[PDB]
Amino acid sequence: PSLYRVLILNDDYTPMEFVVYVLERFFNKSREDATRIMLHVHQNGVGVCGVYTYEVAETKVAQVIDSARRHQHPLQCTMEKD
Numbered sequence: 001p002s003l004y005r006v007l008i009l010n011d012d013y014t015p016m017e018f019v020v021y022v023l024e025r026f027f028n029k030s031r032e033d034a035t036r037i038m039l040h041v042h043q044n045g046v047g048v049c050g051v052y053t054y055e056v057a058e059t060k061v062a063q064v065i066d067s068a069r070r071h072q073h074p075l076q077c078t079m080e081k082d
């Protein structure tokens with residue numbers, strides 16, 4: 001039962017608030033944690049949102065893209081074997 005990391009990539013145009021909204025909503029973070037991960041990514045260029053089983057991980061990558069495309073932001077999100 002291998003696991004997979006769900007990451008988001010930093011870009012220069014996506015609002016800070018939407019990134020915080022995303023983590024709170026799709027990754028189940030309190031607003032303190034959300035703020036941390038968002039700030040971390042902003043400086044590091046990449047950050048782990050969470051770690052799940054493959055398909056759980058897969059659903060979360062898809063929901064972040066589908067969501068990002070509706071707010072019309074270019075937030076990049078993908079996965080990788082933990």
Ligand SMILES: [Mg+2]
Nearest residue numbers: 003051081082
């Ligand atoms: Mg390990």
